[model samples]
Target: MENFQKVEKIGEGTYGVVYKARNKLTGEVVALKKIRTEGVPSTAIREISLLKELNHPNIVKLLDVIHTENKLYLVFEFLHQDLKKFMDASALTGIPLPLIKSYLFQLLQGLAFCHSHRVLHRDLKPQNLLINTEGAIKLADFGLARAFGVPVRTYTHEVVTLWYRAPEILLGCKYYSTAVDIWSLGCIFAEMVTRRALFPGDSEIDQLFRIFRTLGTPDEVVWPGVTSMPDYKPSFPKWARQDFSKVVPPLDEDGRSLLSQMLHYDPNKRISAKAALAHPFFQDVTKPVPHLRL
Candidate 1:
């Protein structure tokens, strides 16, 4: 605490407040997240535990963790802005296709790394994807992330944000996997192409409907056991599968194909992050350029 000088508040969420700070000795800029110490929340515990094990270029670097008498501070490398802010800034002009490809590639690479380690980033949205000046995309905010595996345990569907949530989750599937994160990437992929959310639903029902309308309603034939879910709706309006080319005019055939596979109704059918990295959509993306302020 004494070694770093708080410069400005960066963000606030259910977990705690994050601030931009400068290290007194090294002069390095860092993001300081103050965790409330009143019985230490599960989010804090999860974030700390997972971040300590994750180390990759596309993932935010946790510099240090400090514990004081009544509080805990998580020091992270400071990023210039988040993907949401970047998208909002380019609302009118739209993000360049090359840049969009680069961003998506970095996102999937990070996700692939996380998945390989058996970690599931339950909450992945534009707001949590940080971008530095060098155009480097780093996945941040691990409060909702957890290490998942083998036994196929049941998890709360109350994870990922509504717009990016998977159909299985919205339909009340207790046992989910990395497919949830891939679904979020699909939503982000569309948003990056269109400069707006692909499915901006107001509520759970609306969200599910929006997804159904975009991708077509899933029947047991297409998504077996879908109706068996606890909250499955039997009488929803049937929707025909939408043309990806029309929905995301900017995406090429390969890009649309990858996005469609990622947004599959069945978690089992959704493309894995590692597999998505090898999709033809990224065949032309060269190595990421070094970090530069954007």
Candidate 2:
């Protein structure tokens, strides 16, 4: 509002509704995100610190920072569609192979960069992914879960969704690691191919079962310290592993292999983004094709 003129409407974003705006002087266009609530979030401040440090083709760029009238309005290079909407559009025709491969690879690289930099996205979802006209996938809205209380129930309808939450975090594990993000990416990888939520659950406990039923319920042997997790119980239902081949039949063997590594039961054993980048699945990934029209 201060330096940029609102151009067109961008729907409700992860943090707030982002507006397409043109710079009043430079005549440049960009996305302007002004946080919704009033009393400035101490939570919002930390994300700003983290965003400025990260720079990558797969991550959104924070262009300018402005806190006017005691409110925070952030500037970001505009990207076309949120993957959430893009997924819906492409799902009608089934997302193509090259596009899926390109997007996922870009996603992994962005994640690897952040992991190497000691940052955990904590929240990874279709809505949090941005797709540009160039058909690029850029991770957006980082540090929200890290800053905002992890579900805090009462006011969480839009704050967080359980669909891509990691198993460990679901089981009351207080500490977060790269594995959490990896797990979410694994779910995301599967969804891009299936065009559906990999684990669509409305509640936390059901979310765990959705994952457990597919990946097999964990045990002490599989996840060394599984018994010690605050929510673990001796009476937990036993579930066997389901075939990834059938779960996501369209994905090839190499892609399935990469997905399994990301969705491992133990966070310690889960694949790191650096290693996922070198996986055979991305061997043929080239520059992404234009998605603006398609």
Candidate 3:
């Protein structure tokens, strides 16, 4: 506890403040997320347990836990920035081509690890993706994703864009499965290709319509019982056969082919993380290095 030195405030999360700090003894820079809660929060305990369970290169590592009365500091291996921050600061061209393939492949690798363990990261967005100068990307601030009381502030829950959200979620579906992640991956995949949000809707309705227009509105034929879902609206205008080719024209035919499956209208039809990893879109992703070529 005393060995770690707080250098600066990096950001805040739903729980509390985060700092870019260093260990005085070994001089290792780390991220110290100072949690705010009254007693030992159940979320805190569960969060730690899951972190321990999900140990992978693509998943952020919880290095140490420093708990005190009012503050609980969760120590983590520091990544320079989250993908969201990087995107905003980066050129509108967004992430480079080779880097995009590398990044998403690693992300799916992380997703495979989570689903394999029967865990679902309900919150999967660029903001939760942490990346460092060394070209390593890892998932962070995950598994607390039941949409429990988040406020709009430095934590960025309010800054949340549903662009990466799946159609099932927007349609008021009650149960969420691994398919949701695959859907979001498709959105993220497209977002990287164009360097722009594919469905940049600020609200729920607008977001739904954004997707409807791009991929064409869903119907009973595409997703069984999609209209059976609670929020389904018959009055919603129909927009058909329209696909990613219209927007991300720069994307290769093979890329969109793989994406079409990921963004399948029926959640059940979406590709699995393992399958997406092996898909032809990633065939040229032979070399993981030269990442960012940094």
The 10-residue segment of model 3 with minimum total lDDT is: 146-155
Which runs of model 3 end up more than 4 angstroms from their true locations? 1-3, 24-26, 36-44, 65-67, 88-94, 146-157, 288-294
TM-score of each: 0.87, 0.91, 0.87
Q: Can you write out model 1's per-residue Cα lDDT over 1-294, one digit (the tens) per residue?
A: 589888988866434678899999999999997754256555555556656768899998877767666467788888888988888888888878888889989889999988887767776889889987667898885434442112121122223357888888788777768898999989998999998899999888999999889889999887888888888868889999988988998678999899989988888888998899899988898554433435
Error of 3 at 253 (Å): 1.2
lDDT of 3 at 96: 71
In model 1, the runs with Cα more than 4 Å from the true position are 41-47, 147-161, 287-294
Q: lDDT scores for all predictions?
A: 0.79, 0.82, 0.78
Question: What is the RMSD of candidate 2?
Answer: 2.4
Model 1, C-alpha of 163: deviation from truth (Å)? 1.1
Q: Would you list the clashing residue pairs of candidate 2?
A: none
Q: lDDT per residue, candidate 3, 87-145, as tens digits?
A: 66665555677888888889899989988987777767787788876677888864545
With a 3 Å backbone cut-off (N, CA, C), the pairs that clash in candidate 3 are: none
> What digit string (tens of lDDT, one per residue) describes model 2 on residues 67-137?
67887777888877788888888878877888988888899999998888777888898887988777788
